[PDB]
Design a protein around this ligand. Structure first.
Ligand SMILES: COc1ccc2cc(-c3nn(CC4CCNCC4)c4ncnc(N)c34)ccc2c1
Length: 452
């Protein structure tokens, strides 16, 4: 079984957990799929291969409309290839923030789907452990679309990335008992309870300035309904949340029994019988939450991509140098492609051609490979820079064009950028800052925070 014999890469879907997800296509049937590629080297394995193989085989036989469908599994010297069904509706919360109105009925429908998928998985002795909004995909970008839970069962066999770009946002959802090391399927009920709390209020129940702060709250396990917007919420919803966020797991309600709860039964009726006031403050809060999380993540990815492009700028120049037997610094289309491939090893024809368009539109002769290197790398870093700008713009909901010092403290705390470190970098960028930054200044800060 060779992965590449069956599937061709089409386009990247993202970096998710444990590795990158690539949209692939079956070479024979044309069938599209999402393949999670996990590098055995860059990621450690918890269990022996036999245990992993058995769990994979089980997963292939399981089917539920709220669980991502696993089709196939491949392995080579370097990697595991997990072939799943592709879902195109994006992350649940990125949908929710676009909505104009949101009620308890909406929240209930969402949670019943999650609880349903979880219950089926627990029946089969599969635990998630890292349940969070990022792991709730939509079959289509619509409030009517079905939810598919991704990454069930991965945490049992693979160690999580300790890189903060990977870690962002994880602290809010993790069960206290996971932190302390003794856990079972009840941890997934806890995470779901955290998600329900956020849907109804727009604010995490366990919150803080940074990762440790948040984890400290989770561990203590104390939370409240003190916020004003909890006045608009039914006692029934609050009651379920209490049961889901019960500290001791044996006393914590099960996924199965949570489906049976009065709130779920009452509010997921096809026919809306009960009062449905729009949880307007929760929406505003949820948008603020998502925006913050997305900007912090984009910031780390941007800094990461900057460093990566620095390495690859040096390598690419070295490679072309060797090829530059003449020493005139000019190469042809063939040579440029070959070198690009050399670096890649360290589709192709088309990417070089895009570069040459800008460089030498007429294509009359040879190319200053130096000029090529520059343009080539800028196209590689585009996604991250535009994504950064988009996240900045989205976070800036009033279109002020600026982010305040208070907002920066939140963004950087979530990002594990030390308070004293970022403030010092701000001072270097703008001596006369007024306790706010525009986009360019923010970007200048990030550059300085990654050795630039
Ligand atoms: C255990 O075997 C498998 C096999 C394939 C899997 C595919 C996905 C998956 N990831 N992404 C990228 C999104 C980018 C935005 N943030 C949320 C995720 C996806 N996008 C669309 N469809 C998908 N199926 C995924 C996740 C886990 C998988 C596990």
């Amino acid at each position: 079984a060779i992965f590449s014999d069956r599937y061709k890469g089409q386009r990247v879907l993202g970096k998710g957990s444990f590795g990158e997800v690539i949209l692939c296509k079956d070479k024979i049937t044309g069938q599209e799929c999402a393949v999670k590629v996990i590098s055995k080297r860059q990621v450690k394995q918890k269990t022996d291969k036999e245990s992993l193989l058995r769990e994979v085989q089980l997963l292939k036989q399981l089917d539920h409309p709220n669980i991502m469908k696993l089709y196939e599994f491949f392995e080579d010297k370097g990697y595991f290839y997990l072939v799943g069904e592709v879902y195109t509706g994006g992350e649940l919360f990125d949908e929710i923030i676009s909505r104009k109105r949101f009620s308890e009925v909406d929240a209930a429908r969402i949670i019943r789907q999650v609880l349903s998928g979880i219950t089926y998985m627990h029946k089969n002795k599969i635990v998630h452990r890292d349940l969070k909004p990022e792991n709730l995909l939509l079959e289509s970008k619509s409030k009517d679309a079905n939810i598919r839970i991704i990454d069930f069962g991965l945490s049992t066999h693979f160690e999580a990335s300790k890189k903060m770009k990977d870690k962002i946002g994880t602290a809010y959802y993790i069960a206290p008992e996971v932190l302390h090391g003794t856990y079972d399927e009840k941890c997934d009920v806890w995470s779901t309870g955290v998600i329900l709390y956020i849907l109804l209020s727009g604010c995490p129940p366990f919150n803080g300035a940074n990762e440790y702060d948040i984890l400290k709250k989770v561990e203590k396990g104390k939370y409240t309904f003190e916020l004003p917007q909890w006045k608009k919420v039914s006692e029934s919803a609050k009651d379920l949340i209490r049961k889901m966020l019960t500290y001791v797991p044996s006393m914590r309600i099960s996924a199965r029994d949570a489906l049976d709860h009065e709130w779920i039964q009452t509010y997921t009726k096809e026919q809306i019988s009960v009062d449905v006031p729009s949880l307007d403050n929760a929406i505003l809060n949820i948008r603020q939450f998502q925006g913050t999380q997305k900007l912090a993540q984009a910031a780390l990815l941007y800094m990461g991509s900057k460093l990566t492009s620095q390495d690859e700028t040096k390598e690419l120049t070295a490679i072309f140098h060797k090829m530059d037997k003449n020493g005139d610094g000019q190469l042809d289309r063939a040579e440029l492609i070959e070198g690009y491939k050399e670096l890649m090893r360290m589709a192709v024809e088309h990417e070089v051609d895009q570069v040459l368009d800008a460089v030498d539109f007429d294509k009359n002769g040879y190319i200053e490979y130096s000029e090529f290197v520059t343009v080539a790398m800028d196209r590689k870093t585009l996604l991250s820079r535009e994504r950064l700008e988009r996240a900045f713009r989205m976070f800036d909901s009033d279109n002020s064009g600026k982010i305040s010092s208070t907002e920066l403290a939140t963004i950087f705390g979530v990002s594990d950028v030390d308070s004293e470190t970022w403030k010092s970098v701000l001072s270097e960028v703008d001596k006369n800052n007024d306790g706010e930054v525009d986009f360019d200044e923010f970007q200048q800060m990030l550059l300085k925070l990654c050795g630039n």
